[PDB]
Curated annotation (Swiss-Prot), chains A, B:
It comes from the Eukaryota. Induction: By hydrogen peroxide and UV irradiation. In pancreatic islets, expression increases under hyperglycemic conditions. Expression is also induced by sulforaphane, an isothiocyanate obtained from cruciferous vegetables. This is Parkinson disease protein 7. The modification Phosphotyrosine is found at Y66. The modification N6-acetyllysine is found at K147. Its EC number is 3.1.2.-, 3.5.1.-, 3.5.1.124. Changing V50A: Disrupts dimer formation and strongly reduces ability to eliminate hydrogen peroxide. Keywords: Acetylation, Autophagy, Cell membrane, Chaperone, Copper, Cytoplasm, Disease variant, DNA damage, DNA repair, Endoplasmic reticulum, Fertilization, Hydrolase, Inflammatory response, Isopeptide bond, Lipoprotein, Membrane, Mitochondrion, Neurodegeneration, Nucleus, Oxidation, Palmitate, Parkinson disease, Parkinsonism, Phosphoprotein, Protease, RNA-binding, Stress response, Tumor suppressor, Ubl conjugation, Zymogen. The gene is PARK7. Changing C45S: No effect on mitochondrial translocation neither on deglycase activity. The lineage of its organism: Eukaryota, Metazoa, Chordata, Craniata, Vertebrata. The active site is at C105 (nucleophile), H125.
Length: 187, 187
């Protein structure tokens, strides 16, 4: 029974923070759905890479629930996630069922917007710290990956492998994470 | 006068090895063209991420020459690159004009197929070593990034940032590379 991941892809998402987790999760045998916030049309990422989603978010939701919901960063992508009523519903449902939520870079600021996981330790990109910490609803961490129970956060493009492997470990265990890691030629 | 990069994208390419260099090069102010080997249609990468190219290779060639030609890895992508007469022509032209060629993971095996850069020190993914070394036409290196003049090679998804930043340094200099590196939150 393969674990399942929903990756929510919005215009302006950081394409490295999208593709690295998708690829690494698929290497781990996770069934990943790349869901387009705006529909099933191609998505123009922050550095103009264009990714064609597997499904619209609307359709992907109907196939839930998922073992993890993943929010990439990119400031504009995160803002689009933060403004979305559909994302709010998905995240609240995931929180209510005690499912993992993973967000990287500016992505965690969508948790703030949707009032998810208050009281957790979190990290973000350094430049997103002040936005995330508005109101003091979370406790800030400088760890490259932070995990406080079912809220898993990370910092930037250069922490994306660590973030992805932390998701793999949480879903499929340490041994699978180590097996997936070795062929990547990480330092 | 911005430097220009051609990234040749074939079915089965490693999507991390494609997107990380594209994104990092664009962060460096390089004008990058993601060119589809097969045409301007979407490309299904090795772990099923679908990327929409900027142009067909046919059209992209007409807008050359480029300051760097970049070959991602992925075994099936590299095989498609290795079988392509169009890629052969582009690489030979680039070599003849003393322009940089950069290849990662299985990507360097397309250099072997097209008889490019013989006598250079190169690296590859560990699993691609024997293919690359058939005939002894190159000298093998275990360095995470190897550069022997105008032939720049690297090893895997986990060396992609290092590979991309080496390209940036070669084109735009050490200072730009350092400036681009810091916001990435690399270790
Ligand atoms: Zn980011
Ligand atoms: Zn590879």
């Amino acid at each position: 029974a393969s674990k399942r991941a929903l990756v929510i892809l919005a215009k302006g998402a950081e394409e490295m923070e999208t593709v690295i987790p998708v690829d690494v999760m698929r290497r781990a045998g996770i069934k990943v759905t790349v869901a387009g916030l705006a529909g099933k049309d191609p998505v123009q990422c922050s550095r103009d890479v264009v990714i064609c989603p597997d499904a619209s978010l609307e359709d992907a939701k109907k196939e839930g629930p998922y073992d993890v919901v993943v929010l990439p960063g990119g400031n504009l992508g995160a803002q689009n996630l933060s403004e979305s009523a559909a994302v709010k519903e998905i995240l609240k449902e995931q929180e209510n069922r005690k499912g993992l939520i993973a967000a990287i870079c500016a992505g965690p600021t969508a948790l703030l917007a949707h009032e998810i996981g208050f009281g957790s330790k979190v990290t973000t990109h350094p430049l997103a710290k002040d936005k995330m910490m508005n109101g003091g609803h979370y406790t800030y961490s400088e760890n490259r990956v932070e995990k406080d129970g079912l809220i898993l956060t990370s910092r930037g493009p250069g922490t994306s492998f660590e973030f992805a492997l932390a998701i793999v470990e949480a879903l499929n265990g340490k041994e699978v994470a180590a097996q997936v890691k070795a062929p990547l030629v990480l330092k």
